[PDB]
Design a protein around this ligand. Structure first.
Ligand code: HEC
Ligand code: HEC
Ligand code: HEC
Ligand code: HEC
Length: 107
């Protein structure tokens, strides 16, 4: 593949909306975020019926949370994960690329 999204996409969850810009993640491979599905190309919602549908549960491969605030070991690369490694160089953006309160994610 589809065309790289231009207008920020909303990541509706429980009762909050966290906008996500693709530009910033234009260099980062799509395979990095958009992991293959059963060894097949996909581009459905991160929380599509069957997948990370659960937005409440914390742990679980079906939790939209476990695929965001999961710095531990996983099958793919998490956001907070990369970010952590990213800020690794710029610990001054940790309040943006990891910050819980007043972050590029949580406003
Ligand atoms: C993580 C840093 C990402 C990278 C790298 C790319 N995309 Fe992405 N994409 C990401 C998120 C968090 C979302 C929203 C999921 C949600 O449901 O909240 C998306 C969404 C898309 C879509 C929209 C899917 C739809 O419902 O129609 C498309 C078409 C898409 N992404 C394409 C795309 C391409 C082509 C990328 C590489 C060039 C790419 N994305 C990178 C996160 C990330
Ligand atoms: C993007 C860079 C994020 C950063 C940084 C942090 N979080 Fe987050 N969080 C993010 C999204 C996209 C969502 C919504 C998806 C969903 O699962 O609904 C969330 C949601 C939460 C929640 C709500 C889950 C619930 O309680 O049911 C909480 C409590 C939460 N996030 C906490 C949290 C903390 C403590 C963070 C710092 C370590 C943090 N978030 C960073 C994306 C991002
Ligand atoms: C169903 C078609 C899915 C969609 C859409 C997305 N993911 Fe996913 N993801 C899926 C499964 C079945 C699993 C578990 C792997 C297994 O052991 O079978 C995962 C895993 C992840 C992980 C790692 C967590 C783990 O269990 O190791 C992450 C970080 C992750 N997924 C992120 C992610 C993102 C960002 C998505 C949208 C861009 C996304 N997934 C869509 C199934 C599906
Ligand atoms: C590395 C593999 C990354 C992964 C995985 C995710 N993001 Fe990321 N993010 C990354 C970089 C390099 C940056 C910019 C920091 C810099 O080097 O200057 C970011 C920034 C963001 C932001 C900030 C918004 C903005 O500045 O416009 C947001 C909101 C963000 N990232 C969200 C996000 C989410 C939700 C991810 C998983 C769904 C995610 N990122 C993955 C690198 C990487």
């Amino acid at each position: 593949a589809p065309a790289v999204p231009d207008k920020p996409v909303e990541v509706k969850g429980s009762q909050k909306t966290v906008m996500f810009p693709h530009a910033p993640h234009e260099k980062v491979e799509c395979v990095t975020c958009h992991h293959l599905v059963d060894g097949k190309e996909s581009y459905a919602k991160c929380g599509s019926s069957g997948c990370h549908d659960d937005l409440t549960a914390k742990k679980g491969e079906k939790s939209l949370y476990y695929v965001v605030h999961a710095r531990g070991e996983l099958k793919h690369t998490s956001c907070l994960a990369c970010h952590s490694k990213v800020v690794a160089e710029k610990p001054e953006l940790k309040k943006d690329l990891t910050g819980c309160a007043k972050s590029k994610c949580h406003p």
